[PDB]
Design a binder for this molecule. Structure first.
Ligand code: SAH
Ligand code: ZN
Ligand code: ZN
Ligand code: ZN
Lengths: 8, 425
C-alpha cells in the first residue's frame, strides 16, 4: 500500500 | 524548495537533490496536501479538513458522519465533502468505498476547481506522476478496475470522471506516489497526495523523514546532506530483512533498492537472529520457519479485520512459542508478533499485558532501526503513556523524554506534538 513507517 | 531541485537520477527516474547543505533537524521544505482524506475509523476524533485532533467537533447536520473544528472548516471542506455528504445518507451502511477510491475522488474534484499548478506541485505535478502502467500485471489491473467501478458506484452523482484509461493511470499514480498520514504513535490517520514530497526516491538508510502538521507534510534531515546529494525518504517499515523489504518494494513500487543497507545486508544477521542451541536448526529448517513467519504475518494482517481480540492474542502467542524454539526475542519476526500482541492488549484495555510486551520490544527496536526513527520514538511514547497511566512516573517521564528527543529532530523542536507530550510530563 501507500508510503508509511509502519502498517504491519 | 529554493535550495532544492528535481533532476534525473540514473536508474531511478526523477528525484530531489540538495543545492545547499542540511544539518540533522533542518526543515528541507513543507508541502501542502493536494488531496487528503481522513480514515473511516478516525471519524469523530479528527477534523476532516485540517486533521486537528480535538474534542467537541461539529457533526455535518445532513450526514451526521463528518466532523469539523467549526463552520469554517465545514465550509472550506464542503467542495471535497460534497462528493460524500449525500451518498452517506442515501447508501446508509453500504457506503463502503476503499480509502484509495475516496482519495482518488478528491483528486478529480480538485482538478475541476483548481486546474492550474497548485502550491503542492512546485516541482512535480499530479499529471506528471509515475504510474508504471507498462509494468502492471493482471491482478493489479484487476484491483484498479474494481476501484474504478466503486468510484462510479458511489460518486457518479457528484464528480466529473474522465475515460476509463485515464483513471487506470491515475489510480496507478496514486499507488506509486501516495502517502499515509500517521500520528505520533504511528497510527493510521488517513491518506494524502503530496506531489512535491513524492519526487523523493527511496532508501533503507534515508537522509530525510516525512512528518505531518495536520494535512501539511514536513521534510526534515536525519543525516547530514551536502550540496549535489540526492534526498531519500523511506517508503516502507525498515525493521525487516533485505529480502522482505525488497519483496514489498518490487511489489508496490517496481524496483529493487540498492542502498548500503541492501548491499551489505549488515543488519540481517541480527534481524533474523537464531538461538545458540546444541541442536541448532538447519539452513532448511531456518528457511522453513522464516517462510512460516511471513505467512503468519500476512494472515494476522487479514485476520485483524474480523477476528475477536482474544483470538488475535491467541495466534500471537501461538506464533511466538513456536518460533521461540529457534528465534531469539530480538528476532524481527518475534518482534512483529510482540508488537501486534501489544496492540490487542491495548484494545482489550489490558494495560499491564501491553506494557509487558513494550518492554521486550524497545531495545531490539533501537538496534534494528536507524537513528532518529519515529518507529522507536512512538514505542517509547507508547511505553511512556502506559507507565503514566499506571502511576509509574519515573519510568514514564524517562520514556517520554526518549520520545521527545527523537521527535525534536524529526518533527521540529516546536511541533504541536512535543508540547502535547511535555504537558504529560
Ligand atoms: N531506491 C530506488 N531505486 C530505484 N528506483 C526508485 C528508488 N526509489 C524510488 N524509485 C522510483 O521512483 C518511484 C516512486 S515515485 C518517486 C519519483 C520517481 N523517481 C519519478 O520519476 O516520478 C518508484 O516506482 C521507482 O520507479
Ligand atoms: Zn478543522
Ligand atoms: Zn455531510
Ligand atoms: Zn535499501
Amino acid at each position: 500500500h501507500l508510503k508509511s513507517k509502519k502498517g504491519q | 524548495l529554493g535550495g532544492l531541485e528535481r533532476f534525473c537520477s540514473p536508474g531511478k527516474g526523477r528525484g530531489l537533490r540538495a543545492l545547499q547543505p542540511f544539518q540533522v533537524g533542518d526543515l528541507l521544505f513543507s508541502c501542502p496536501a493536494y488531496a487528503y482524506v481522513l480514515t473511516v475509523n478516525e471519524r469523530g476524533n479528527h477534523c476532516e479538513y485540517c486533521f486537528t485532533r480535538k474534542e467537541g467537533l461539529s457533526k455535518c447536520g445532513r450526514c451526521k458522519q463528518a466532523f469539523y473544528c467549526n463552520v469554517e472548516c465545514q465550509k472550506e471542506d464542503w467542495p471535497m465533502h460534497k462528493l460524500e455528504c449525500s451518498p452517506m445518507v442515501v447508501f446508509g451502511e453500504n457506503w463502503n468505498p476503499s480509502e484509495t477510491v475516496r482519495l482518488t475522488a478528491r483528486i478529480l474534484a480538485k482538478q475541476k476547481i483548481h486546474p492550474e499548478r497548485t502550491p503542492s506541485e512546485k516541482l512535480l505535478a499530479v499529471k506528471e506522476f509515475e504510474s508504471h502502467l507498462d509494468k502492471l500485471d493482471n491482478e493489479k489491473k484487476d484491483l484498479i478496475q474494481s476501484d474504478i467501478a466503486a468510484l462510479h458506484h458511489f460518486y457518479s452523482k457528484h464528480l466529473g470522471f474522465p475515460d476509463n484509461d485515464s483513471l487506470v493511470v491515475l489510480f496507478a499514480q496514486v499507488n506509486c506516489n501516495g502517502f499515509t498520514i500517521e500520528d505520533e504513535e504511528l497510527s493510521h490517520l488517513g491518506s494524502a497526495i503530496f506531489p512535491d514530497v513524492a519526487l523523493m526516491n527511496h532508501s533503507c538508510c534515508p537522509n530525510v523523514i516525512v512528518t505531518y502538521k495536520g494535512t501539511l507534510a514536513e521534510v526534515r534531515a536525519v543525516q547530514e546532506i551536502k550540496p549535489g546529494e540526492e534526498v531519500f525518504t523511506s517508503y516502507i517499515d525498515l525493521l525487516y530483512p533485505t529480502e522482505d523489504r525488497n519483496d514489498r518494494l518490487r511489489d508496490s513500487y517496481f524496483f529493487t533498492c540498492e542502498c548500503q543497507e541492501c548491499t551489505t545486508k549488515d543488519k540481517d544477521k541480527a534481524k533474523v537472529e537464531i538461538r545458540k542451541l546444541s541442536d541448532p536448526p538447519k539452513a532448511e529448517a531456518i528457511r522453513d520457519m522464516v517462510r512460516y513467519a511471513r505467512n503468519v504475518i500476512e494472515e494476522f494482517r487479514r485476520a485483524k479485520h474480523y477476528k475477536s481480540p482474544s483470538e488475535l492474542l491467541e495466534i500471537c502467542e501461538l506464533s511466538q512459542e513456536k518460533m521461540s524454539s529457534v528465534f531469539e526475542d530480538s528476532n524481527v519476526y518475534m518482534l512483529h508478533m510482540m508488537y501486534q500482541a501489544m496492540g490487542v492488549c491495548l484494545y482489550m484495555q489490558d494495560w499491564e499485558g501491553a506494557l509487558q510486551y513494550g518492554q521486550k520490544i524497545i531495545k531490539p527496536y533501537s538496534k534494528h532501526y536507524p537513528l532518529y526513527s519515529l518507529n522507536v520514538a512512538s514505542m517509547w511514547l507508547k511505553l511512556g503513556r502506559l507507565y503514566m497511566g499506571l502511576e509509574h512516573k519515573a519510568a514514564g517521564e524517562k520514556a517520554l523524554k526518549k520520545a521527545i528527543a527523537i521527535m525534536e529532530v524529526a518533527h521540529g523542536k516546536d511541533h504541536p506534538y512535543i508540547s502535547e507530550i511535555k504537558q504529560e510530563i
